[PDB]
Write a protein that binds this ligand. Structure first.
Ligand SMILES: Nc1ncnc2c1ncn2[C@@H]1O[C@H](COP(=O)(O)OC(=O)c2ccccc2)[C@@H](O)[C@H]1O
Length: 517
C-alpha cells in the first residue's frame, strides 16, 4: 500500500475516488438514498454551511446521529471543511453528552431528531460553547435558533475546495470508556482511515465496487465507521444503513432485500448478534440471501457460533480484533482462512507483540499482553496526558488484552488485563453496574463479574448482599435497573448472598466470584 501524500484531506480523497461513479447509490436507508454525486454535493454544501456559521478549522462539532444517509454527509462535510466531527454513541445519558460538549469544546451539534431530547438536557446543564444545533429529521418542533439539517445544507452553495489539511492532522474523534472515569476522546488523523480502509477493507476483506455493505455495528463504533463508511467508499460499494436497533428480524428484513431494492453481500456484526440470529426461528435459508462475506468483531467469536453459521449458510464468519485506538482490525482471520477458536493472524501492515510481566518476551503457548504497532493508531486521548502515556507506549499501542500465539502463527484470545467486559461486543464496566445496584435502598453491597453464557458469550452476573431489615426481591431489582442501564448492561443473573469474599482492606475478591465460590 502506498502511503497517503502529506497534503491530504480524507473527505476529498473519498469524494475523488467516486467521481468515476456519480450515479451509483452510495447510501440507502429506510426512507432515502444518495448517489455518489448527491453525497458529494451535500457533503460540500454542509462544509460550507458549517463555515458560514463561523466554525473554524481545527474546531470540533458533535455528531450525535442514528445511522442514515445524513450521517456520512455530516461526517465527511465537517472533514472536507477541516472541522473535526466527534462521532458519539447514541445510547448515552445527558450527563455523558454534557461532558462531551465541554471536553470537546464542540462549536455546533448535528443531532437526529430522536436524540434531540437527551441533547437538550445536555445543553441545559453544561458550560458548553455550542453556537448552533442542526437537527436531522426533527421529531418535535425546532426551538428558536435551531435549524433543520435539510435546510441548513440546502441553503448553502458547495464549498469549492477542501481545507488544505495534512495527513497527520486530526480529522475526527471517537470516544471510548474504561472501567472508571469519564469517556476518553480518541483523536484520529486524516491518514488513519486511509490505512484501515486499504490494509483491511481492501487488502484483507477484498471488498469491491459491486458489494452491498450492511453493518449491524453503527457508524459511531470504530468497527462500523470502517464497515459502512470508509471501506465501501474506498471501493465504490453501495451501503445499506439502518436507524433502528439491530434485532434478528430487522437484520433478516434487510438480508432479504426488504429495503432500497438491495440485498447485502457483506454483513458485519458482533458474535452476540450472530448467536441471536442462529437461534431465531425465521433464520433465512441460503437461497434467500446474497451474502458472500460475514465479518465479526467486538468480542471473541465462540467457535460453535462460527461452525453453526458455516453449516447453515456455507459462509464462514471472519473474526478479527480491532480497537477504537487502532481505528480498525489489526489481527484477523481471512475470508479464505478461518481457524475457529482463534483471532487469526496479524493484518499485513500491523506488527503485533505479546509482552510478559516486565515487558519481556513470552514463549509460544503462554499468554502475554497485546501491543500493536501500525499506521492507523490514534495520536493521544485528548486532554488526558497520563492515560495517553499509558496506552501510547512509543509507536506501540497497548490494547488491554492478553493473547496466546499458536504454532501456526494464529493468536487465541486470553481475556482483558483490566476489569472491562464486552457484552454484546460493546464495553460495560462492572463498576458502573455495581454503582447502580448499591443505590437501591434494599442493597447493602454488590459485586459484578463476567460469566460465560450457554453460547460462551460473556454477560455480567451480579452478586448482591441485601440490607438486613429491608425487603428486596429479584423482580424489584430487575425493575430498578431496566430503568437505569442500557439493556446490553443488564446482569444475566443476580445471586443474593449473605456476604462477599474480601481482603482485610475490604477489597472484594472478584476472582473468587468468577471461580464460583
Ligand atoms: N474479535 C475480537 N475478539 C476478542 N476481543 C475483541 C474483538 N474485537 C474487539 N475486542 C475487544 O474489544 C476491545 C476494543 O473495544 P472498542 O469498542 O474500542 O473497539 C472494537 O471493538 C473494534 C473497533 C474497530 C474494529 C473492530 C472492533 C479490544 O481491546 C478487545 O478487548
Amino acid at each position: 500500500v502506498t502511503p497517503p501524500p502529506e497534503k491530504f484531506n480524507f473527505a476529498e480523497h473519498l469524494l475523488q475516488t467516486n467521481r468515476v461513479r456519480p450515479d451509483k447509490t452510495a447510501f440507502v436507508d429506510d426512507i432515502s438514498s444518495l448517489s455518489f454525486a448527491q453525497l458529494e454535493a451535500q457533503t460540500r454544501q454542509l462544509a460550507a454551511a458549517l463555515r458560514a456559521i463561523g466554525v473554524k478549522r481545527e474546531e470540533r462539532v458533535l455528531l450525535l446521529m442514528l445511522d442514515g444517509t445524513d450521517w456520512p454527509v455530516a461526517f465527511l462535510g465537517a472533514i472536507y471543511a477541516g472541522i473535526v466531527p466527534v462521532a458519539v454513541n447514541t445510547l448515552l445519558t445527558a450527563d455523558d453528552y454534557a461532558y462531551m460538549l465541554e471536553h470537546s469544546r464542540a462549536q455546533a451539534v448535528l443531532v437526529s431528531g430522536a436524540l434531540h431530547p437527551v441533547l437538550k438536557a445536555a445543553l441545559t446543564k453544561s458550560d458548553h460553547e455550542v453556537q448552533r444545533v442542526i437537527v436531522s429529521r426533527p421529531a418535535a418542533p425546532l426551538e428558536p435558533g435551531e435549524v433543520d439539517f435539510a435546510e441548513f445544507v440546502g441553503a448553502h452553495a458547495p464549498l469549492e475546495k477542501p481545507a488544505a489539511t495534512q495527513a497527520d492532522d486530526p480529522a475526527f474523534w471517537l470516544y471510548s470508556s474504561g472501567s472508571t472515569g469519564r469517556p476518553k476522546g480518541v483523536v484520529h488523523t486524516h491518514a488513519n482511515p486511509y490505512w484501515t480502509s486499504e490494509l483491511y477493507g481492501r487488502n484483507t476483506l477484498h471488498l469491491r465496487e459491486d458489494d452491498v455493505c450492511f453493518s449491524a455495528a453503527k457508524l459511531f463504533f470504530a468497527y462500523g465507521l470502517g464497515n459502512a463508511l470508509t471501506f465501501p467508499m474506498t471501493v465504490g460499494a453501495t451501503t445499506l444503513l439502518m436507524g433502528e436497533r439491530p434485532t434478528p428480524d430487522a437484520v433478516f428484513k434487510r438480508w432479504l432485500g426488504g429495503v432500497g431494492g438491495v440485498k447485502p453481500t457483506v454483513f458485519y456484526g458482533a458474535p452476540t448478534g450472530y448467536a441471536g440470529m442462529l437461534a431465531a426461528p425465521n433464520l433465512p435459508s441460503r437461497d434467500q440471501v446474497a451474502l458472500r462475506l460475514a465479518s465479526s468483531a467486538g468480542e471473541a467469536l465462540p467457535a460453535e457460533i462460527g461452525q453453526r453459521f458455516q453449516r447453515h449458510f456455507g459462509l464462514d464468519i471472519v473474526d478479527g480484533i480491532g480497537s477504537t485506538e487502532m481505528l480498525h482490525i489489526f489481527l484477523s482471520n481471512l475470508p479464505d482462512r478461518v481457524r475457529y477458536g482463534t483471532t487469526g493472524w496479524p493484518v499485513p501492515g500491523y506488527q503485533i507483540e505479546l509482552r510478559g510481566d516486565g515487558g519481556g518476551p513470552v514463549a509460544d503457548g503462554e499468554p502475554g499482553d497485546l501491543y500493536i504497532h501500525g499506521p492507523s493508531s490514534a495520536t493521544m486521548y485528548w486532554g488526558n496526558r497520563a492515560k495517553s502515556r499509558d496506552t501510547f507506549q512509543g509507536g506501540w499501542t497497548k490494547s488491554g488484552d492478553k493473547y496466546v500465539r499458536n504454532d501456526d502463527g494464529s493468536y487465541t484470545y486470553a481475556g482483558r488485563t483490566d476489569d472491562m467486559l464486552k457484552v454484546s461486543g460493546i464495553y460495560v464496566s462492572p463498576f458502573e453496574i455495581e454503582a447502580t445496584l448499591v443505590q437501591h435502598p434494599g442493597v447493602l453491597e454488590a459485586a459484578v463479574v463476567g460469566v460465560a453464557d450457554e453460547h460462551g458469550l460473556t454477560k455480567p452476573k451480579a452478586y448482591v448482599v441485601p440490607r438486613p431489615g429491608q425487603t428486596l426481591s429479584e423482580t424489584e431489582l430487575k425493575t430498578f435497573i431496566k430503568d437505569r442501564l442500557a439493556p446490553y448492561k443488564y446482569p444475566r443473573s443476580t445471586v443474593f448472598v449473605a456476604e462477599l469474599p474480601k481482603t482485610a482492606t475490604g477489597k472484594i475478591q472478584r476472582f473468587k466470584l468468577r471461580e464460583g465460590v
